[PDB]
Amino acid sequence: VNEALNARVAALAEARLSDAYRITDKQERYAQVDVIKSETIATLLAEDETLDENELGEILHAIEKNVVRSRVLAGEPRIDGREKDMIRGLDVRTGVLPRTHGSALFTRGETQALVTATLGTARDAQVLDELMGERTDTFLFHYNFPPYSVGETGMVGSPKRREIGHGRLAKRGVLAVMPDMDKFPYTVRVVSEITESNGSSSMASVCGASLALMDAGVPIKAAVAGIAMGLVKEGDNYVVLSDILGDEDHLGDMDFKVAGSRDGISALQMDIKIEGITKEIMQVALNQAKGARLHILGVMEQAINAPRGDISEFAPRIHTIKINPDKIKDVIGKGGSVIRALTEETGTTIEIEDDGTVKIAATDGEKAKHAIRRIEEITAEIEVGRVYTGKVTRI
Amino acid sequence: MLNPIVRKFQYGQHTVTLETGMMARQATAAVMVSMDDTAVFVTVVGQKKAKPGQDFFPLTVNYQERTYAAGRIPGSFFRREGRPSEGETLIARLIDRPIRPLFPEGFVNEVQVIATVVSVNPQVNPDIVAMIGASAALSLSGIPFNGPIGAARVGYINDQYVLNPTQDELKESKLDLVVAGTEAAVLMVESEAQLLSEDQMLGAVVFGHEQQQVVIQNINELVKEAGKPRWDWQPEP
């Protein structure tokens, strides 16, 4: 145990740490704690050349965690002022980026996710070899966690389950509410970049994805939001924390992440580090999570009520028109001459597919309308017989 | 609650817009710069405690092009274009070269600049938007840095200089030249030319530098309206 050093440092600090945590200002607390800390750090350095951070810090951090621990169990405001049921302040804005198929910024206190959706043709679907059987995914999710998000320098790209966890949890959360391929023909990719983080940012990407998809006009069957929960237990007594910071990790003995619509769970993750959880405790834990999740989904619905009817002008729009099948010839031409002329001027890809059906595509609506307008004056054309006012072009 | 501070000026027939405060609020400074539809999110982090052993300046600049910025799925083998290509590494060098000597003598704190392209109109190149974004993001922060930098691209068409040509005008032009500089002086020039005379090249450099000044005017207006206080950093005696 090495208790003699444990006891002496506890006597020097506990009485002053338990004072400092009552302070309402985040910054003055931090400042006062960092002073008490270094003092008894140094003061017992006087008694002997005892250890440095190697032991002191540790013996100290523990006193701190035990202090927050007892404060939370007793029934005192948590380290950030909130009680044991208040998700932090929310702000939500949509269409935040120009010329993306649909995009949103979701914010919960210090946590932010910037999320964007992109539409592909059936050709853009990912196809993959696995031992249990090869698969084709029409829904794709990517999660990026750059170092500035946590206020630190380092490698801009670093791969960890910190990201594949949050890349997979978020996908499971949204996958349940996606439209079926026969209603919505496009492949969809969503990417979430965590612009800033206080630990719990996977669930901010679920909320941001639901906004980004509605903005893009994907017909998702309902909005989906997520909450990060923790439970503190000591003897028979326990308390459940509705929305939990990246540093109150120590408080959580069981922490569970739950995501869904107003009327059912879509994904659930739980880790239980301490024995003596029972079905009764899990029942009340999820019942509190439901209250918080239903609050967030209310604020999201106020920002955007339903998915829009227009697919983003820039996103590709599959369509076809039935022009006169016999008129094929003056849209082909000798050696495909009027195909080459139409496709190069209009910058639009053109096909005749089946019995006079024309398929036409580009990035811009301008190009597509130009092409359509051009083929509607060669074929399906207003030339029945009645008199027309013509501008004289050449003589 | 979240409140963005925006200053929109004008610049060679396009209209740049600078936004702050709204996002990555935990970075030292963060700016969403956007000319026309080409938008790039640029963020600075620098650590206040200089490593006690250190004896050089560890500046790192990372420029990354997200494919969702053009509304295309990746469709590639290597980590969905995870590693930076040549096409990205060169643009990082174009940001590094004018910035690196403009930090004060004896500064040794680690600094990291990340520029991520989040939208692109195909006619307006994001590189020189990233360059004015890096200028904004350094100058908004407390970090000790010798004044803002502009950036400009000059073309040559029918014997007239053209500021910021679009990607179509560029193919008609017999010159492609980037300039970066301060109120006082040019810092960096890089160019391709179809066998122009040395006089025509310096004409381009002067013309570029004379009108990148409008970027410097607007950056200084944002800095005193929304800038963090300067670090209490002093030179090593």
Author numbering:
A (entry chain B): 238 to 632
B (entry chain A): 1 to 237
Authors' description from the paper:
Structures of E. coli apo PNPase have been limited to the catalytic core and parts of the KH domains (Nurmohamed et al., 2009). A full structure has remained elusive, but it has been assumed to have flexibly tethered KH and S1 domains protruding outward from each PNPase protomer. The structure of E. coli PNPase in apo form reveals for the first time the wide conformational landscape of the KH and S1 RNA recognition modules.
